[PDB]
Amino acid sequence: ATVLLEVPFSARGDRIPDAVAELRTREPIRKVRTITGAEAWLVSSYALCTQVLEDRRFSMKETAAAGAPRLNALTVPPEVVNNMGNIADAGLRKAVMKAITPKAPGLEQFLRDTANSLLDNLITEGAPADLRNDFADPLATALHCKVLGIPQEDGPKLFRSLSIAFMSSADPIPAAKINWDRDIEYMAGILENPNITTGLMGELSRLRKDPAYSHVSDELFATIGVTFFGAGVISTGSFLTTALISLIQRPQLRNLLHEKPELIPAGVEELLRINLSFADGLPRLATADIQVGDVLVRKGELVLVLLEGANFDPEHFPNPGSIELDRPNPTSHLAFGRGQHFCPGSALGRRHAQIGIEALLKKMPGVDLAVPIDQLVWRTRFQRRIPERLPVLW
Numbered sequence: 001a002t003v004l005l006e007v008p009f010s011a012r013g014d015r016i017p018d019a020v021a022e023l024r025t026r027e028p029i030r031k032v033r034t035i036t037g038a039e040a041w042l043v044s045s046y047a048l049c050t051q052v053l054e055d056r057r058f059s060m061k062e063t064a065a066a067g068a069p070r071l072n073a074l075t076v077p078p079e080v081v082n083n084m085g086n087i088a089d090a091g092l093r094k095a096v097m098k099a100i101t102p103k104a105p106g107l108e109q110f111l112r113d114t115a116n117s118l119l120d121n122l123i124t125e126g127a128p129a130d131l132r133n134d135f136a137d138p139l140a141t142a143l144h145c146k147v148l149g150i151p152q153e154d155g156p157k158l159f160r161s162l163s164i165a166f167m168s169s170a171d172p173i174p175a176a177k178i179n180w181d182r183d184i185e186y187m188a189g190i191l192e193n194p195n196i197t198t199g200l201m202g203e204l205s206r207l208r209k210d211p212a213y214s215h216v217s218d219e220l221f222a223t224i225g226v227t228f229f230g231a232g233v234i235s236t237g238s239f240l241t242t243a244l245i246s247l248i249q250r251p252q253l254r255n256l257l258h259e260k261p262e263l264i265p266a267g268v269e270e271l272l273r274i275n276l277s278f279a280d281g282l283p284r285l286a287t288a289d290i291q292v293g294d295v296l297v298r299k300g301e302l303v304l305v306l307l308e309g310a311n312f313d314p315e316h317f318p319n320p321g322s323i324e325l326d327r328p329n330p331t332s333h334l335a336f337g338r339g340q341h342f343c344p345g346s347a348l349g350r351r352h353a354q355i356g357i358e359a360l361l362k363k364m365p366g367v368d369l370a371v372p373i374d375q376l377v378w379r380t381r382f383q384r385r386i387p388e389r390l391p392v393l394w
C-alpha cells in the first residue's frame with residue numbers, strides 16, 4: 001500500500017518534475033495531502049487553474065477560517081489573509097496601487113543606480129559572487145524601501161524577518177509572531193514619523209489624518225506596510241534569483257538579450273512563465289459545491305492552484321519548457337495569479353527583474369554558475385523556492 005500523494009513535490013526551482021506533466025494529463029484535478037495532514041484538490045491544467053482563480057466562490061479569505069483544512073499554518077493574524085480586501089473596503093485600493101507602480105519619477109533610475117552599484121561592488125570584490133544574497137535580494141529590499149518611503153538603512157532588519165515570515169509550516173511558528181509584532185510597531189512608528197512623506201507610507205500617513213479616512217484603523221495602516229514590504233521583497237527577490245538561474249543556464253539567450261536589450265521585457269515575460277518560485281499551489285477554500293473537471297469539489301474543501309501546472313501546460317503554451325520570445329499569448333501566464341487577487345505589484349515586479357537583468361548583462365556579460373547546478377541548496381518548507389546561495393563567476 002502507498003499513501004496519498006504528498007505536496008509539494010520538490011523544493012528544486014531549477015527544473016519541473018516530470019510528474020507534473022503526468023499528473024496534468026491523467027488527473028488535472030486530484031486529491032493530495034498537505035504538510036499539515038489535510039487533504040486538498042491539486043489543480044494542474046491551465047483551463048482548470050484559471051477556472052478556480054476566476055471563481056470567487058473559491059475563496060482566499062476563507063482559507064483563514066478556524067477548523068479549515070490547511071495548506072500550512074498561518075504566519076500572520078487571520079485578518080491579514082484578506083489584506084487587499086480590507087484595503088479595498090477602507091477605500092485605499094487606488095492610492096495603494098498608485099504608490100507601488102514603477103512609474104514614480106526617478107524610481108526606475110533608482111533601480112538602475114542600485115543594481116549597478118551592487119554589481120560594481122561584486123566586481124571589485126572578485127568572483128565568486130552570490131547573486132541572491134548580494135544582488136537580487138538587496139535590490140528587492142532597496143526597491144521596497146524606496147517604494148514605501150522608508151529609510152534604506154531600515155531595510156535589512158525588515159528583510160531578516162522574511163526567512164521565517166514566509167515559511168510553509170505544518171505548525172504555527174513562534175518567531176513569526178515575535179517578528180510580526182516588532183515590524184508592526186516599526187510601521188506604526190513610521191506613520192507617526194514626520195520625516196516620512198514620500199512613497200506608500202508617506203501617502204498612508206496623510207490619508208490617516210484625512211477626515212475621509214478617520215474611521216480606518218491604525219492597525220490596518222501599519223499592516224499594509226508590513227505586508228506589502230514582505231510580500232513584495234520576497235516575491236521580487238525570489239523571482240529574480242530563479243530567473244537569473246534560468247538565464248545563466250541559457251548562454252544563447254544570455255547573449256541575445258545582451259546584444260538586443262530591447263528583447264528583455266519579452267525575455268522576462270517568458271522567465272515569469274517558466275518560473276518555479278512559488279513552492280506551493282495557491283490555496284482557496286470552496287464556499288459551495290463546484291464542479292471542476294471530473295470532480296465535484298465540496299463546500300469547505302481546500303483547493304490548490306499549481307501555477308507551474310498552468311504555465312507548463314502544452315495545451316496553452318506549446319513546447320512549454322522552451323523559452324520563446326515570440327509567443328502569441330506571452331502575458332497570459334499565471335505567474336501573477338488571475339482574477340480577484342491578481343498581483344497589484346505585477347508592473348513593479350516586471351520592472352525590478354527587467355532592470356536587474358539589463359544591468360547584470362551589461363556589467364557581467366560572461367556571467368556563469370561558479371558551481372555545478374546540482375550544488376545549489378534549495379530552501380525547504382518555504383512559500384518560495386530559492387537557492388540559499390547563488391555562486392557565479394564572469
Ligand code: HEM
Pocket residue numbers: 060084085100227228229231232233235236239240282283334335336337338340341342343344345346348349350
Ligand atoms: C515577480 C514579482 C511577483 C510575483 C511573481 C508575484 C506573485 C503574486 C501572485 C501569484 C499573487 C496571487 C496570490 C493568490 O491569488 O493567492 C500575488 C498577489 C499579491 N501580491 Fe504579488 N507578486 C510579485 C510582486 C509583488 C510586489 C512587488 C508586491 C507589492 C509591493 C506584491 C504584493 C502582492 C499583494 C498585496 C497580493 C495580494 C492580492 C490580493 O489578495 O488581491 N507582489 N502576487
Ligand SMILES: Nc1cccc(-c2cccc(-c3c(-c4ccc(O)cc4)n[nH]c3N)c2)c1
Pocket residue numbers: 060075076080081082083084165166226227230231232235343
Ligand atoms: N506577492 C504575493 C504573492 C502571494 C501572496 C501575497 C500575499 C499578499 C497579502 C497577504 C498574503 C498572505 C500571508 C502572509 C504571510 C506572511 C507575511 O509576512 C505576510 C502575509 N499569509 N496568507 C496570505 N494569504 C499573501 C503576495
